[PDB]
Amino acid sequence: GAQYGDAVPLSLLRDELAQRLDQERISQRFLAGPVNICTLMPMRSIPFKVVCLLGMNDGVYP
DNA sequence: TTTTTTTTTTTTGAGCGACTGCACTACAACGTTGTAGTGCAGTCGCTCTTTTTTTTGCTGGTGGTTTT
């Protein structure tokens, strides 16, 4: 799409394909049936009754 | 294009340095012999650490799992 004319080696395309195969995004699906195990972002202000916070040691969070 | 069998483990330390025994000549004590010093070879102890250091995009943004 940029109309590149010069030669492109193998390692650049190999690293670009390796970067696009490990781009699996963190799932934010919520199921109302079972208890939801998830990270902080998906529900920021949703008002649940019981709220548990794991992994609150130094270095990891924030 | 088809198809057969099968239950037995092995090996691994070597260089450095001392202990002890026998041979071998030099030299003084009593021509010959006993004591002393060294060379070479078989046998044997011993001994060979300690450790840790990191950036990676939570959903960076037309994004988003699941039913007929």
Side-chain angles (χ1 to χ4, degrees):
Chain A
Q3 297 184 357
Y4 198 85
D6 301 330
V8 176
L10 177 73
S11 59
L12 265 63
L13 301 180
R14 185 179 68 251
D15 295 330
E16 189 64 35
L17 191 58
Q19 284 293 329
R20 295 197 197 186
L21 284 181
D22 209 359
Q23 53 178 4
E24 300 291 328
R25 65 161 41 201
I26 291 179
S27 177
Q28 52 192 13
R29 173 210 66 191
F30 170 105
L31 308 190
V35 184
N36 304 94
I37 285 306
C38 73
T39 175
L40 296 295
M41 288 202 60
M43 321 176 237
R44 295 160 132 274
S45 192
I46 295 182
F48 290 101
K49 294 183 176 301
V50 180
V51 170
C52 306
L53 292 172
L54 298 184
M56 289 303 177
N57 60 91
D58 197 9
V60 179
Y61 193 84

